[PDB]
Design a protein around this nucleic acid. Sequence first.
RNA 1: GCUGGGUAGCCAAGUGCGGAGCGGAUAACUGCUGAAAGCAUCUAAGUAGUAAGCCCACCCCAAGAUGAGUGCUCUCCUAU
Length: 178
Amino acid sequence: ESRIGKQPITVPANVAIAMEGQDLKVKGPLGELSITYPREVLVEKQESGFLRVRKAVETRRANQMHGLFRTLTDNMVVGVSKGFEKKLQLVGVGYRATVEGKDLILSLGFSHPVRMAIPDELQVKVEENTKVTVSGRDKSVVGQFAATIRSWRPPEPYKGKGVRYVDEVVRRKEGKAG
RNA sequence: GCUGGGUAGCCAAGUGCGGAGCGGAUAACUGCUGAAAGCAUCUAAGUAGUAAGCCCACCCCAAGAUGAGUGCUCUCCUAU
């Protein structure tokens, strides 16, 4: 009954499929990844472009785990090819996010500017000093480091100050009790 | 006997020193990816921040730790 799982997995152009025993070796054009799979879930390669994954109705991983697994390789395979990106609008008085080599320098106005270290493989675009957008590969490992920048100053309820999700509509409560 | 001084020792009111870690796992909490439930959701797989609290680390003891550990070195002649 999985309405995401019933949909076949779109395998785009230049998808390097391979097996490491139980893992699906997702190594497209830009690099490499790793995805492990249980004994109750055999991922089929049905010899017709598309891909669908097997169930095993003893527990209800047949219901639920195929939400993760049949959407993991949706984003893992695309992720190596294109890459998923998350966006950051910084708003306020003197909010620079310049980049000196490896680390960032977010000078939000604490005292010492905040040097968020750029991790192993990922790279980050920088629209201006005023705005940033983090490119990458996967959806998971990009989102954590993206969320760490949003953590330093959340979107605040009076001026909409500090960091912002570009998509998110954060409220502005009536400041000064006006 | 009563006073006035006082080296060493012992004493403080005197002199030194101390409380430190970008180490680990957590609690409330904030999350990322993400179904069940085409959407959502911090969770059911996985994972990140994250406390004078908990565990290592500091300092003293410690193999009677009968589970008696490990290392280096010395000694085994006779009435002595």
